[PDB]
Design a protein around this ligand. Structure first.
Ligand SMILES: CC[C@@H]1C(=O)N(C)c2cnc(Nc3ccc(C(=O)NC4CCN(C)CC4)cc3OC)nc2N1C1CCCC1
Length: 116
């Protein structure tokens, strides 16, 4: 009968995943920053997410009922997967994507261990 994680705590966890080290490229929707990529980018990435959308989702209770924040991890994995796919696995920001995902997953697992 898990009670669920506090929405504001999950939203602050999400906000903390937006790093200057990653040049803030996961902070905002890619098509909001570059509207003319819509056709080309949606062909490679039919699903998108970003940390401003994930923070707003966290405040709606989208992730609060997952015991190990599985839904948030899938949204983080989508962000990193799209970056690797669109830019290329040997691109410089595909390495940033793998580091971001690894950092984010450690911060999520730490949150779950703290709020248990
Ligand atoms: C397909 C595009 C590709 C990609 O995959 N993603 C995800 C992407 C997402 N966002 C961006 N760019 C930025 C988007 C938002 C911000 C931003 O909002 N920063 C804030 C500004 C105000 N400040 C007080 C706080 C930080 C900065 C960005 O770049 C510096 N570029 C992206 N690239 C890059 C293209 C060349 C290789 C990577």
């Amino acid at each position: 009968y898990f009670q669920g994680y506090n929405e504001a705590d999950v939203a602050a966890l999400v906000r903390s995943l937006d790093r200057a080290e990653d040049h803030h490229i996961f902070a905002v929707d890619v098509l909001e920053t570059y509207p003319y990529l819509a056709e080309s980018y949606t062909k490679v990435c039919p699903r998108r997410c970003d940390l401003a959308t994930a923070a707003q989702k966290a405040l709606e209770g989208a992730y609060s009922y997952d015991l190990r924040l599985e839904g948030l991890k899938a949204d983080i994995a989508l962000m990193a997967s799209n970056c690797v796919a669109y830019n290329g696995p040997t691109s410089a920001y595909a390495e940033t994507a793998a580091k971001f995902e690894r950092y984010a997953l450690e911060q999520i697992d730490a949150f779950v261990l703290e709020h248990n």
